[PDB]
Each structure stands twice: as structure tokens, then as C-alpha cells.
Amino acid sequence: WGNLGHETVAYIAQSFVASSTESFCQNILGDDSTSYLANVATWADTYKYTDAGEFSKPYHFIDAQDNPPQSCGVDYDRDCGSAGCSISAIQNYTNILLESPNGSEALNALKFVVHIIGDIHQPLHDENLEAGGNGIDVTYDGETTNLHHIWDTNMPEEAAGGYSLSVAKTYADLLTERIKTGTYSSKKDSWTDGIDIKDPVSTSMIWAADANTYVCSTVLDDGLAYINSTDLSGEYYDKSQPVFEELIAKAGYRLAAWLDLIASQP
Ligand SMILES: *[C@@H]1O[C@H](CO)[C@@H](O)[C@H](O)[C@H]1NC(C)=O
Ligand SMILES: [Zn+2]
Ligand SMILES: [Zn+2]
Ligand SMILES: [Zn+2]
């Protein structure tokens, strides 16, 4: 996701964590604001463009070697790769926070976890096709961009009505209410099924697999002919909105559950 997506995921999670989890995080981050997670939720996207953080670029995705829209699926060993991936990063950074939450590596670990749980839920961060769709040029609202970009940024920013922290907060609030009492409030009871703080690979793969099914059902189900030739800010946006909204909600909720586990220090 772009910044708005990551901040919305972070604010959602802030709404569901226990108060000891909040303190646990605020202490690591040195931030006692009511935006403590949101404020660090984009950091990994900065860090990967620095010389020192270049090595972390692959941690944003798992390039699923599947065949969408006909066939979707993710496999850790097949798809992660030689330089690591979202899944291996969640394992490594989760275990740092389980082993040394007060150590020097915990600050970046937590920043990573907040960001990457977000990324795992962007379906094109779980998809190899044309560099996760970065190679698929498309027209969005009369302007040229790419398919990955409109999922990261154009479409969420349109649905949220902007891109500022306060817009992310308002968006998070809307989605959090969907989880509590609205359209997600039944389904959400099963969004943490299979979660296991002692198996970060398996837990994060479930989330990645889940998000990846939407490559076939939604991202690409019209076919590349349509996608390459149609302005995607029309009916494509309308079809995609419920899906990216639910995924951002799942990301927030799952992030909170995972942070509550880490803070509980098993
Ligand atoms: C769509 O465009 C992508 C490149 O951006 C290309 O690889 C693909 O072959 C195109 N497919 C069709 C059906 O136009
Ligand atoms: Zn992202
Ligand atoms: Zn992206
Ligand atoms: Zn990212």
C-alpha cells in the first residue's frame, strides 16, 4: 500500500489492541501520541530507498508464482526467494520482539511488523505477474499509471477522500465500525483463525494466501485485455473498493491480534 493504506491499517490496529499492548508499543517507539502506530507505519517504505535499507526491499512482498486469474496460490519456499520476503520478515521481526523487546533491534522490528502486515494484505504484494503488476500500464482517471500503483494508492486515496493522517484516521474509524457492528462483524470472528505466535511463517502465509485469492477473484478477473484498455477509475474501482476495504480492515484487525500476542510475551 501507499502511505494512506499503511496509516489506515495502523489506526485500525490501535483501536483493537489491549492497553498493555499499546504501552508495549509506545515504549518501544518512544511515542505516546494517539498516532503511535500510524506515525511509523510508512517508515519501511522510506528505509528501503536508502543505501542502508536497500536489503529490505523484498520484505514488502511474496511474489506468488501462480497463473491468475485462472489459478491463484502462494507457496513459501517456491515464492519467497533468495533475498527474503514479507513472510520471512514477519518471522524474523516477530521473533526479535518475542526475544528482545527492550533491545536495540526492537524499534525497527516493530516498525517492520506494522508495515508488512499491511503489505501482506495488498493482493499485488502477493503476486509475481509483471513485477506484482508494476509492469502493467493502465489508465486511471484519464492518466497513465500502473496496476500496482492504483491498488497501492489511487484507489484507496479516492475511497478515503485524500491522503493525510487525519483522512487515514477517519477512514480507519469507518472500517473499525464495520468490524465492530457493520458488514464485517460476523466474518471478523474468523479472521484470526489459525493465528499462532509460535508459527509466524504459517500465520503470515494464511494471510498472504487469503489476500492472494483476490488476485484471481478481483484484481485480474476481467482479463488483461480489459485492464490494459479500460479506464480503471470506473466500474473496476467500484468492484475493487469492497475488496481493498475489507483487506485493509483484515490487515488492521490481524495486526492488533498479532501485537497483542507479541506484547503478552509467551
Ligand atoms: C497487457 O499489457 C501487459 C504489459 O503492460 C502485457 O504484458 C500483456 O501481454 C497485455 N495483454 C493484453 C491481452 O493486452
Ligand atoms: Zn505498502
Ligand atoms: Zn506496493
Ligand atoms: Zn511496503
Residue numbers in the entry: 21 to 286
Authors' description from the paper:
S1 nuclease from Aspergillus oryzae (EC 3.1.30.1; NCBI sequence ID: XP_001818636; S1–P1 nuclease family in Pfam, PF02265) is an extracellular, single–strand–specific, sugar non–specific, Zn2+–dependent, fungal nuclease with 3'–mononucleotidase activity with a pH optimum in range 4.0–4.3. S1 nuclease has the phospholipase C/P1 nuclease–like fold stabilized by two disulfide bridges. The active site is located in a surface cleft and composed of the obligatory catalytic trinuclear zinc cluster supplemented by Lys68 and the nucleoside binding site 1 (NBS1; also called Phe site in the previous studies). A cluster of three zinc ions coordinates the substrate/product scissile phosphate and the reaction mechanism utilizes water activated by Zn2+ ions as a nucleophile.
A phosphate ion inside the zinc cluster in the first binding mode is modeled with occupancy 0.5. Phosphate ion is a product of 3’–mononucleotidase activity and simultaneously an inhibitor of S1 nuclease. This structure brings evidence for one of its binding modes and for its capability to bind inside the active site. The inhibition effect of inorganic phosphate was tested on ssDNase activity of S1wt under standard reaction conditions. Phosphate inhibits activity by 70% at 10 mM concentration and by 91% at 100 mM concentration.
